[PDB]
């Protein structure tokens, strides 16, 4: 019972956090696959 | 009104995909950062 209204808003702010974490993770990869060639 | 139930679920899909994305992520960093040290 543990009200969608707010599961699901809880989940988007959790999910938009994670998109943020991949996008800084790609671009230091970005970095490392550059000082590698 | 785009059902609450579903859209929670397509979520979670979502969330765990990502979660899984950042992991793998994590780990090409580690590879990196241990390349350069």
């Given at each position: 019972?543990?009200?969608?209204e707010?599961?699901?808003?809880?989940?988007?702010?959790?999910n938009?956090?994670?998109?943020?974490?991949?996008?800084?993770?790609?671009?230091?990869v970005?970095?490392?696959?550059n000082?590698?060639?």
């Open positions: 019972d543990p009200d969608l707010i599961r699901a808003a809880f989940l988007e702010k959790e938009t956090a994670l998109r943020t974490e991949v996008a800084e993770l790609r671009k230091e970005g970095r490392c696959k000082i590698v060639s």
